[PDB]
PDB file of C-alpha atoms and ligand atoms in Angstrom:
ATOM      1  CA  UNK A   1      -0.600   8.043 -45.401  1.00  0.00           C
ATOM      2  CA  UNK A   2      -4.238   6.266 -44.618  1.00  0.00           C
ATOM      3  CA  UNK A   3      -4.503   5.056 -48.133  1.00  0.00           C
ATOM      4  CA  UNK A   4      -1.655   3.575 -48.432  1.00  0.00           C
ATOM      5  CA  UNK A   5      -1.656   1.882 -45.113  1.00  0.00           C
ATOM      6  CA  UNK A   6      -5.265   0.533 -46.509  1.00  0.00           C
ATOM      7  CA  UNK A   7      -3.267  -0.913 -49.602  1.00  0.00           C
ATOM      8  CA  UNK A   8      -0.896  -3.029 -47.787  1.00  0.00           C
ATOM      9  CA  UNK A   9      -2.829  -4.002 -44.455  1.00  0.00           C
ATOM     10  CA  UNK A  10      -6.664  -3.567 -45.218  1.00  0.00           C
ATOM     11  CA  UNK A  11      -9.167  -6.059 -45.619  1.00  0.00           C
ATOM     12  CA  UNK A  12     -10.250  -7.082 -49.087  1.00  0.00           C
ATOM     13  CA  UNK A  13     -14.518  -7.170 -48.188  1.00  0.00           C
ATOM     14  CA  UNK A  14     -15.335  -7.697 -52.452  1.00  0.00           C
ATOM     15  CA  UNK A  15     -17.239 -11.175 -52.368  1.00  0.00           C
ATOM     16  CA  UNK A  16     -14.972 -11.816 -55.943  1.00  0.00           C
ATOM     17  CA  UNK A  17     -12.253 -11.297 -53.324  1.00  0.00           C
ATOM     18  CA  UNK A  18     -11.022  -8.428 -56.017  1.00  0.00           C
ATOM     19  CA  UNK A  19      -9.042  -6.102 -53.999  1.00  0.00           C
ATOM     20  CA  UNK A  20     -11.869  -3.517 -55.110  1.00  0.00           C
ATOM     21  CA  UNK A  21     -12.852  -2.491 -51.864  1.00  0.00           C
ATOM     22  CA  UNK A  22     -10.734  -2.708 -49.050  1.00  0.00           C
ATOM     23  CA  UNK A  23     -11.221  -1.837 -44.952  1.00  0.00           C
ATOM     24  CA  UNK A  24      -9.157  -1.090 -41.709  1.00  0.00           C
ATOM     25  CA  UNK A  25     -11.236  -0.252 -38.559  1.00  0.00           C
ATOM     26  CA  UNK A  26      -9.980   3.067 -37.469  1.00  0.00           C
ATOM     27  CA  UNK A  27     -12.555   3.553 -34.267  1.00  0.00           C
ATOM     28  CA  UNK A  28     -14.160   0.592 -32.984  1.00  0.00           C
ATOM     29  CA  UNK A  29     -18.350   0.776 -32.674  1.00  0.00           C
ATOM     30  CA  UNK A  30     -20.168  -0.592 -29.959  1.00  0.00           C
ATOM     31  CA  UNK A  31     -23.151  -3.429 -29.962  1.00  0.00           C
ATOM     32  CA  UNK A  32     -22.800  -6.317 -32.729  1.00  0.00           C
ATOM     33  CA  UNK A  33     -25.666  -5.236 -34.677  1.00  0.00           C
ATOM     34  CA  UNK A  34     -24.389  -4.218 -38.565  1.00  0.00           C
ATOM     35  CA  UNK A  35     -26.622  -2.837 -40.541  1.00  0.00           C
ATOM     36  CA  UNK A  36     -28.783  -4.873 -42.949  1.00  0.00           C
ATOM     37  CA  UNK A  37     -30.263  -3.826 -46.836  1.00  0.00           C
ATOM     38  CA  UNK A  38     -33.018  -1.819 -46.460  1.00  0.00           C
ATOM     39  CA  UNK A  39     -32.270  -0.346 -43.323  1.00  0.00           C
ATOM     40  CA  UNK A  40     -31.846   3.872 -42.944  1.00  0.00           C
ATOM     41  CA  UNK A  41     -28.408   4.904 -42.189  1.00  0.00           C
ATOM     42  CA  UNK A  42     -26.839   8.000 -41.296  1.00  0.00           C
ATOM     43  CA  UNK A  43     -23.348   8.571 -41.556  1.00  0.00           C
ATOM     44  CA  UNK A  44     -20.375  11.527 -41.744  1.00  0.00           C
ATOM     45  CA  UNK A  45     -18.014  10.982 -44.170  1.00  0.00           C
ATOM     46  CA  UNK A  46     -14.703  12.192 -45.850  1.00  0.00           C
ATOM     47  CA  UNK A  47     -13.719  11.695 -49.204  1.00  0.00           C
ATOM     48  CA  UNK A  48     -11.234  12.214 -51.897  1.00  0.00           C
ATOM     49  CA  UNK A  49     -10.280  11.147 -55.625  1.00  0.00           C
ATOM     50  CA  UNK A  50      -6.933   9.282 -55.535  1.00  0.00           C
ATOM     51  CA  UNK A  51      -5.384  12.202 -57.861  1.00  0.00           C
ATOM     52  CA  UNK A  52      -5.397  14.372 -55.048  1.00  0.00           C
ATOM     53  CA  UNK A  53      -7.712  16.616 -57.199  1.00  0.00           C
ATOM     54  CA  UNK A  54     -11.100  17.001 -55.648  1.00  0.00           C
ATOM     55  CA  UNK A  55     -12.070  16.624 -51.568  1.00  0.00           C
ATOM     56  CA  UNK A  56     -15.750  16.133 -50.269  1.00  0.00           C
ATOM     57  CA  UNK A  57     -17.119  15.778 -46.690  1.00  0.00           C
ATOM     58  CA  UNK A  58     -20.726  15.692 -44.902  1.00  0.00           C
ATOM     59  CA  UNK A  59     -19.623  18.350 -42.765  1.00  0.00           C
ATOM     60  CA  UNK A  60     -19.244  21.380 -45.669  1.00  0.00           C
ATOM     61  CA  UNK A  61     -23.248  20.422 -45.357  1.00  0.00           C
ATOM     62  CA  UNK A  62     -22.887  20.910 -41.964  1.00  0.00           C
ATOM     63  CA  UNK A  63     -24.943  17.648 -41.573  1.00  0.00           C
ATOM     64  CA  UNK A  64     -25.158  13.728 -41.753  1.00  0.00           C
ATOM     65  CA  UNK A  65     -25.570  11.846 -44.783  1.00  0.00           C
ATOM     66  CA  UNK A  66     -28.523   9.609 -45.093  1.00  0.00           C
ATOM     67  CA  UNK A  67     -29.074   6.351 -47.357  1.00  0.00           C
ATOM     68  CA  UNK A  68     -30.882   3.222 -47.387  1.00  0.00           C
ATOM     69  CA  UNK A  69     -28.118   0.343 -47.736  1.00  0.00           C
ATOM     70  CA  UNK A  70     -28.470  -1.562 -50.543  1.00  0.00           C
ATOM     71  CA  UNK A  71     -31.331   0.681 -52.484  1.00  0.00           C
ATOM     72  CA  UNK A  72     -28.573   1.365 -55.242  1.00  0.00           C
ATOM     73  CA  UNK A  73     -28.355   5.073 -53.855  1.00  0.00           C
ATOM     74  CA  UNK A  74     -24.505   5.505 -53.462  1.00  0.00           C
ATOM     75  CA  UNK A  75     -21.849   3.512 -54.972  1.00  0.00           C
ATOM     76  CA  UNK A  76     -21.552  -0.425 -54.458  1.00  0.00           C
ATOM     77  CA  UNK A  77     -18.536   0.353 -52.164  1.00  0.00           C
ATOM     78  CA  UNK A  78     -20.583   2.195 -50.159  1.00  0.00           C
ATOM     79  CA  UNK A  79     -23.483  -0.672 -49.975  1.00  0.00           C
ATOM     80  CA  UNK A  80     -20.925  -3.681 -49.086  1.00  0.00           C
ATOM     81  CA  UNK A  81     -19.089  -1.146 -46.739  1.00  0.00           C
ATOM     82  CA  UNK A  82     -21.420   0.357 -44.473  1.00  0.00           C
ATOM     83  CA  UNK A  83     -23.359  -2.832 -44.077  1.00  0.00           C
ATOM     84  CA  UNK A  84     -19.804  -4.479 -42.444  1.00  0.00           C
ATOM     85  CA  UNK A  85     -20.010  -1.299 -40.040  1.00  0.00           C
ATOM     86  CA  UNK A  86     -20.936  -1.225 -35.797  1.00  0.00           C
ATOM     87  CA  UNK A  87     -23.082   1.942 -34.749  1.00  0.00           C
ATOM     88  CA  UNK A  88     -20.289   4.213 -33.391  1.00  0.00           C
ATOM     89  CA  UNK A  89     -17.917   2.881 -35.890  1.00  0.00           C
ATOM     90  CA  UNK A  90     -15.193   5.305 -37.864  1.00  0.00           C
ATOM     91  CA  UNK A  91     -13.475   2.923 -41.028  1.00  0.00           C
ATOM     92  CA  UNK A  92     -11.593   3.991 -43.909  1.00  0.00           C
ATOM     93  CA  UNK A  93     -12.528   2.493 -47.689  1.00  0.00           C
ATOM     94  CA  UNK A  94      -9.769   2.449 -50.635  1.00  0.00           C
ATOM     95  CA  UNK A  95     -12.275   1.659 -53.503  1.00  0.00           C
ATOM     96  CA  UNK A  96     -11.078   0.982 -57.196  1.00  0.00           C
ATOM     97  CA  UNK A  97     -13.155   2.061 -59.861  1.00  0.00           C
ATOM     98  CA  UNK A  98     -15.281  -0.976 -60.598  1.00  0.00           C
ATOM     99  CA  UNK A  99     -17.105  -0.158 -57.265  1.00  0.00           C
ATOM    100  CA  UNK A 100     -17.391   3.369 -57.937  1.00  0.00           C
ATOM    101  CA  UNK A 101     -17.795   5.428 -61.259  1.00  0.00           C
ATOM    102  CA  UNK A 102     -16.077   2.708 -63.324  1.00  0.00           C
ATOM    103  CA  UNK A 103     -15.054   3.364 -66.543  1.00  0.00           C
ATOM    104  CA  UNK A 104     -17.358   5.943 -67.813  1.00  0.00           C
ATOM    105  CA  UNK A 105     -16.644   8.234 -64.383  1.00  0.00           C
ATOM    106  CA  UNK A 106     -18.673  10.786 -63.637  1.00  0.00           C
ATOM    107  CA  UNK A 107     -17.233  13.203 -66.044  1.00  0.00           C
ATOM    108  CA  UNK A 108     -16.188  15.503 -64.545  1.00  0.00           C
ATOM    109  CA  UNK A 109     -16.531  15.713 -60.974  1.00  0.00           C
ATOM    110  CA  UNK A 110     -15.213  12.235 -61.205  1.00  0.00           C
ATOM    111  CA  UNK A 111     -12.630  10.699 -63.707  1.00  0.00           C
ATOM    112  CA  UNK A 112     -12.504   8.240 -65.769  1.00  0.00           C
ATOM    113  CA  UNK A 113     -11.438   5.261 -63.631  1.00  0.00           C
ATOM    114  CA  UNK A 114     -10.965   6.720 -60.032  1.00  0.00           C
ATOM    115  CA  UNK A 115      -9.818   4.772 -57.850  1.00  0.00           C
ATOM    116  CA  UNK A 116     -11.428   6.723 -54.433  1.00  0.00           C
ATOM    117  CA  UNK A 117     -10.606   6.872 -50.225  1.00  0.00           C
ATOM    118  CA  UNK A 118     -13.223   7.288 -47.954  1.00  0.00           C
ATOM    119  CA  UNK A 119     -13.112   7.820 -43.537  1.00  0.00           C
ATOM    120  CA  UNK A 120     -16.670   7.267 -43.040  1.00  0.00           C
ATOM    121  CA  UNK A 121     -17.802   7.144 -39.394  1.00  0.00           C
ATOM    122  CA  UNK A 122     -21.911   5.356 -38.868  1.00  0.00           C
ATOM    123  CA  UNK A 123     -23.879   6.991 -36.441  1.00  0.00           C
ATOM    124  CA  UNK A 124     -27.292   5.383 -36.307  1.00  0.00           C
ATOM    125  CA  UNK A 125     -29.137   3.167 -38.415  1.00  0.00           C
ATOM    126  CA  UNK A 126     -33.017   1.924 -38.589  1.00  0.00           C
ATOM    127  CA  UNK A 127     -35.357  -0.172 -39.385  1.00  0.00           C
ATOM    128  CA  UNK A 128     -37.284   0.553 -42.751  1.00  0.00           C
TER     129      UNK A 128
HETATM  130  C1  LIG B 201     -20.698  11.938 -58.564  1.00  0.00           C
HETATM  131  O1  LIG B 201     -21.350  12.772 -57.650  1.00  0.00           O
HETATM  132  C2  LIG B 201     -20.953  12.925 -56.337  1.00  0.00           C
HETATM  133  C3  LIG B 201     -19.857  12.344 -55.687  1.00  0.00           C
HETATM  134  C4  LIG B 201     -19.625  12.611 -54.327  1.00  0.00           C
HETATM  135  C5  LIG B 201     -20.377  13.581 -53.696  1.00  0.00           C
HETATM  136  C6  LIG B 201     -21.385  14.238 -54.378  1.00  0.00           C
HETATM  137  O2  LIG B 201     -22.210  15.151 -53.827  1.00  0.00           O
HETATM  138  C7  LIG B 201     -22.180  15.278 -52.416  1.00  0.00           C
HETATM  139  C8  LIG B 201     -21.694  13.898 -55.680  1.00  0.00           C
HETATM  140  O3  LIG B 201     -22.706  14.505 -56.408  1.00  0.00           O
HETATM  141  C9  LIG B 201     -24.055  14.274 -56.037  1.00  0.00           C
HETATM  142  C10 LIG B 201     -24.468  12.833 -56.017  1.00  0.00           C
HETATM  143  O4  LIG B 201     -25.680  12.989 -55.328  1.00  0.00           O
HETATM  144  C11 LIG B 201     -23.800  11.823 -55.154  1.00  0.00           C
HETATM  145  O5  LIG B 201     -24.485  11.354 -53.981  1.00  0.00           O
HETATM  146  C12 LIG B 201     -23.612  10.534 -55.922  1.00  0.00           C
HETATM  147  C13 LIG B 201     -23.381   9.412 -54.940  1.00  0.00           C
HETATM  148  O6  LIG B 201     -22.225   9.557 -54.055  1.00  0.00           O
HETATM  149  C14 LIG B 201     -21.716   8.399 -53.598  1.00  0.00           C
HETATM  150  O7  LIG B 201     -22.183   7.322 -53.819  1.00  0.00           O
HETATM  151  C15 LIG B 201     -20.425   8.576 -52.821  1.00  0.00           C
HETATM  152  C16 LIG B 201     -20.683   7.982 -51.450  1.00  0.00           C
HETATM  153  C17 LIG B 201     -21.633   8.806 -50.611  1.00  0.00           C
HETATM  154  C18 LIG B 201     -20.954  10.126 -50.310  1.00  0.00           C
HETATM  155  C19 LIG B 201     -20.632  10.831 -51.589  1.00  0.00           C
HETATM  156  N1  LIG B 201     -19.941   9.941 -52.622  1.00  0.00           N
HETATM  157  C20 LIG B 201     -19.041  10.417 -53.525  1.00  0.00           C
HETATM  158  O8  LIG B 201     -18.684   9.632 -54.422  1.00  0.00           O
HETATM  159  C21 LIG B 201     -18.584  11.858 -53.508  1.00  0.00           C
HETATM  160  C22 LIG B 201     -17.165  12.058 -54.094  1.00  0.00           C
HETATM  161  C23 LIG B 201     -16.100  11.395 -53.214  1.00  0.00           C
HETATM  162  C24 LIG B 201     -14.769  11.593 -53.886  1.00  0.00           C
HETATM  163  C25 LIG B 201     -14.371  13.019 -54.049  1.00  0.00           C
HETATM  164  C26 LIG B 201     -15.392  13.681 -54.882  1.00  0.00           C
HETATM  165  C27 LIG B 201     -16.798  13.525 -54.290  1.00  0.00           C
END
């Protein structure tokens, strides 16, 4: 499946070079321009918990999500992620739990350390 294939052929993007977050490009974007901190960005998104337990997506909301990179507002994966993303871009994110909910989780929507996959596709982003 995706997360598997992330496992063995994704990029490892932690600086620490961790295996905590890892990438593969699944659509490519257009324009260079990545997103830098401080910048709005909107996104859809599809996640789940590795357990197969729990499923989440932007588009129950019928709606894009919307975040300032870097302004702590969504998980560190998310913040070192996105910002390696093209506008037009659609990735997918393996994340172990030291860039998500950790240790503590976030009992109990999310368990004690989750590791969690992500398909996350950037539409737009702006200046601040
Ligand atoms: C722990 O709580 C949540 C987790 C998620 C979705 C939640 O609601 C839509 C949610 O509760 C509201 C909270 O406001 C979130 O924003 C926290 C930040 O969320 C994120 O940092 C990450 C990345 C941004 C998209 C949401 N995502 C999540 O961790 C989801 C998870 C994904 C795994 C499966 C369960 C939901």
């Amino acid at each position: 499946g995706a997360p598997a294939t992330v496992t063995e052929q994704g990029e490892d993007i932690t600086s620490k070079k961790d295996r905590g977050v890892l990438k593969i490009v699944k659509r490519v974007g257009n324009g260079e321009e990545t997103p830098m901190i401080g910048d709005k960005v909107y996104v859809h998104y599809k996640g789940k918990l590795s357990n197969g337990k729990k499923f989440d997506s932007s588009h129950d909301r019928n709606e894009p999500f919307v975040f300032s990179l870097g302004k702590g507002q969504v998980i560190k994966a998310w913040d070192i992620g996105v910002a390696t993303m093209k506008k037009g871009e659609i990735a997918h994110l393996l994340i172990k739990p030291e860039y998500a909910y950790g240790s503590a989780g976030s009992l109990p929507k999310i368990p004690s350390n989750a590791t969690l996959f992500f398909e996350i596709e950037l539409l737009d982003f702006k200046g601040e």
